[PDB]
Design a protein around this ligand. Sequence first.
Ligand SMILES: O=c1cc(O)n([C@@H]2O[C@H](COP(=O)(O)O)[C@@H](O)[C@H]2O)c(=O)[nH]1
Ligand SMILES: O=c1cc(O)n([C@@H]2O[C@H](COP(=O)(O)O)[C@@H](O)[C@H]2O)c(=O)[nH]1
Lengths: 218, 219
Amino acid sequence: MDVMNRLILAMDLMNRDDALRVTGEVREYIDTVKIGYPLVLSEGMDIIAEFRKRFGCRIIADFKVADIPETNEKICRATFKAGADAIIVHGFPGADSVRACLNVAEEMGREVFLSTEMSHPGAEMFIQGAADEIARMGVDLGVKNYVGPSTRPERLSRLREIIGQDSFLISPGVGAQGGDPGETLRFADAIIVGRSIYLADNPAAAAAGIIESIKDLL
Amino acid sequence: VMDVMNRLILAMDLMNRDDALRVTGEVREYIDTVKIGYPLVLSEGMDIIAEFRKRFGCRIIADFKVADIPETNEKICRATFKAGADAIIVHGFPGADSVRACLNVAEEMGREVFLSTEMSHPGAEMFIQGAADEIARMGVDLGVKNYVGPSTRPERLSRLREIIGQDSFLISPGVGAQGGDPGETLRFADAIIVGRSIYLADNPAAAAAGIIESIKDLL
Ligand SMILES: O=c1cc(O)n([C@@H]2O[C@H](COP(=O)(O)O)[C@@H](O)[C@H]2O)c(=O)[nH]1
Ligand SMILES: O=c1cc(O)n([C@@H]2O[C@H](COP(=O)(O)O)[C@@H](O)[C@H]2O)c(=O)[nH]1
């Protein structure tokens, strides 16, 4: 997956007008948008097609899929029907649940991203201790796309070691949560950035600033 | 605690509005509590909650397995309660801050959180099972009152009931299609969740009635 400027916008505004306007403002800097439940549950699944119509961007549906296999399959089908290019899936519920998502993604020509370790403090309680094993499970299952934490570059580095250089790794927690763009890109192929861009006084200048700071890495 | 008619919650995971409405209407005399998840919501919109409220006298539990960072969890809970859900189901494995974010919104908005403890499917044995007792204890520490645990592992459901105490509310999926027994599950759970055994039946009303007949002495 070829992400422009190694920068994925996390579009978590919850109003259609603002989400479309802000995405429009930074469109020259990105070609990949992560859309999650804050926007989808506020404005409907039709928002995905709208983004494709307006921007042509790729859409990663960050739905943290985390149910039993049968339900996971349904969630993935509905999500890809809406035009998402990829979906993010939790590993903590185990291999059968991940495989259910992989099957639908294969059927519809899409990609699954596996959540390994999350970026927030609570991730230390249960997720962190399972994360290396989740990553190895991904490798065993043939998962090629992974998500890991900007806020813990030592953990992000370990996760990169496990999955290898051929796998694709994206990383949230940059900016608002304290992660550094350049340091994160030592290990991740692309950074995910939400609030530092979409809550900025000038989102275009914020995006430009981030890109300037990583210019040598592009 | 919510007063669940016949101790039976319908898991309405049909993805077509017409079928979902038809089946729910057919079983309405037996069930006043419906669990609506992402299969239906992502197919038909959050307005499906509004439509169920309009058509049926049913409480709505939004089974959204909320499993993000605290900031995103808050946004998901707010959107879900705004749409009219009485309660939302949240994962515990992302940790206490993520659960607390949901509890805070629920408190502010006058609604309820249900905490997933151990899940019912085989994959739950890999990571969730080993964390589940601690997830339940965490819920107790955080003041969580409502919990979800697995019909498919009676011994685990029993232990989770002990952890949360008799005063907590416990609902349990995995009955029917996944192999769990209604009566055995109700030894520990306040209510059972049933999906496919009802909604894929030739006569969903007869299927619901049959389940209820089998647990009649437990009502
Ligand atoms: O470990 C993770 C996984 C995520 O998907 N995310 C998501 O990435 C985005 C981070 O946005 P922000 O840059 O505003 O912190 C949010 O949409 C969040 O749900 C995260 O923050 N940490
Ligand atoms: O551990 C769990 C937790 C659940 O919410 N569920 C949910 O409960 C329902 C079970 O439906 P069914 O009776 O068709 O197996 C589904 O909506 C599933 O997503 C589950 O099966 N196991």
